[PDB]
């Protein structure tokens, strides 16, 4: 009723794209979806079913959260089974894979339609960071706490448009990004979330700090040199991730502003976005000097 509905005959499955424990994702054609295009490509998540409640709850939530830098959700197909969720197709996949595929080792081959060859430049990295921050501003505005913000949960589309999601499936491809106790994204979590199990807007800005670090390391795992327990010890004792090689000091300052140990002392995501956007939009003369 709140959720938009799509007729099963308007979805034509093409092939699989990914697969987790709670579902499979297919590339599909969807007819009569938008006035612009009579036919268009979409990504279809098929539920592996109790789970219908979570499914319907997720659909209601996704419909509410719709915005420029949040993953575009078109609606549901509930006529017969399996229950389908229909999303915008994002051709570059998740931001972590994208970052790794354009690292400091990348050359002409990595070049493409949307992106230059070689490592992503400072200007491109800032544009990615800015888009993610804009998504987190919107969620902060609505008083929603993500709890699992990381580059693996962001998608990258044509023209390097970047959008936040939350893929149940991330627990499968990126299993080593979680500590199993339930699965906790320890490496992305602030001391108050690890110690006291409190998750807030402020724990999300900490996590965004880590996302910024991921971006400027071309998708390396935070604390990759550490086991899960060693990482808990480090975070709880106040160790901070080192400045990435590609990160200018100005941007590392924005990361540190996210990692203030006291939640209330962390900069607001709005301030973080404001600074990163200014930098993303700054002229090459300015950016060449950082
Ligand atoms: C090559 C490739 C591979 C995979 C692929 N996958 C897709 C979408 S898959 C998908 N599944 N479930 C989803 N749900 C979800 O994110 N819910 C959610 C829950 C809470 C909060 C929020 C948030 F973030 F908005 F706040 C979102 S989004 C499109 C595509 O184009 N893909 C392309």
Curated annotation (Swiss-Prot):
It is found in: Cell membrane; Early endosome membrane; Late endosome membrane; Recycling endosome membrane. Induction: Isoform TrkA-III is up-regulated upon hypoxia in cells normally expressing it. Changing residue 172 to Y: In CIPA; might impair the function of the enzyme without compromising autophosphorylation. Changing residue 75 to R: In CIPA; loss of function; processed as wild-type but shows significantly diminished autophosphorylation in both neuronal and non-neuronal cells. Changing residue 155 to P: In CIPA; following transfection in neuroblastoma cells and NGF treatment, loss of differentiation into neuronal phenotype; partially decreased N-glycosylation; reduced expression at the plasma membrane; reduced basal autophosphorylation and complete loss of NGF-induced autophosphorylation; loss of NGF-stimulated calcium flux. The active site is at residue 148. The modification Phosphotyrosine is found at residues 174, 178-179, 286. Changing residue 23 to R: In CIPA; processed as wild-type but shows significantly diminished autophosphorylation in both neuronal and non-neuronal cells. It comes from the Eukaryota. A motif (DXXLL) lies at residues 38-42, 105-109. Residues 11-276 form the Protein kinase domain. Ligand-mediated autophosphorylation. Interaction with SQSTM1 is phosphotyrosine-dependent. ATP binds at residues 17-25, 45. Isoform TrkA-I is found in most non-neuronal tissues. Isoform TrkA-II is primarily expressed in neuronal cells. TrkA-III is specifically expressed by pluripotent neural stem and neural crest progenitors. Changing residue 94 to N: In CIPA; abolishes autophosphorylation. Changing residue 258 to S: In CIPA; following transfection in neuroblastoma cells and NGF treatment, decreased percentage of cells differentiated into neuronal phenotype and reduced neurite length compared with wild-type; slightly decreased N-glycosylation; reduced expression at the plasma membrane; reduced basal and NGF-induced autophosphorylation; small reduction in NGF-stimulated calcium flux. The record marks 286 as: Interaction with PLCG1. Belongs to the protein kinase superfamily. Tyr protein kinase family. Insulin receptor subfamily. The transmembrane domain mediates interaction with KIDINS220. The extracellular domain mediates interaction with NGFR. Trk also stands for tropomyosin-related kinase since it was first isolated as an oncogenic protein which was the result of a fusion between the tropomyosin gene TPM3 and NTRK1. Receptor tyrosine kinase involved in the development and the maturation of the central and peripheral nervous systems through regulation of proliferation, differentiation and survival of sympathetic and nervous neurons. High affinity receptor for NGF which is its primary ligand. Can also bind and be activated by NTF3/neurotrophin-3. However, NTF3 only supports axonal extension through NTRK1 but has no effect on neuron survival. Upon dimeric NGF ligand-binding, undergoes homodimerization, autophosphorylation and activation. It is linked to Congenital insensitivity to pain with anhidrosis: Characterized by a congenital insensitivity to pain, anhidrosis (absence of sweating), absence of reaction to noxious stimuli, self-mutilating behavior, and intellectual disability. This rare autosomal recessive disorder is also known as congenital sensory neuropathy with anhidrosis or hereditary sensory and autonomic neuropathy type IV or familial dysautonomia type II. Chromosomal aberrations involving NTRK1 are found in papillary thyroid carcinomas (PTCs). Translocation t(1;3)(q21;q11) with TFG generates the TRKT3 (TRK-T3) transcript by fusing TFG to the 3'-end of NTRK1. A rearrangement with TPM3 generates the TRK transcript by fusing TPM3 to the 3'-end of NTRK1. An intrachromosomal rearrangement that links the protein kinase domain of NTRK1 to the 5'-end of the TPR gene forms the fusion protein TRK-T1. TRK-T1 is a 55 kDa protein reacting with antibodies against the C-terminus of the NTRK1 protein. This is High affinity nerve growth factor receptor. It comes from Homo sapiens. The lineage of its organism: Eukaryota, Metazoa, Chordata, Craniata, Vertebrata. The chain holds residues 500 to 795 of 796 of the full protein.
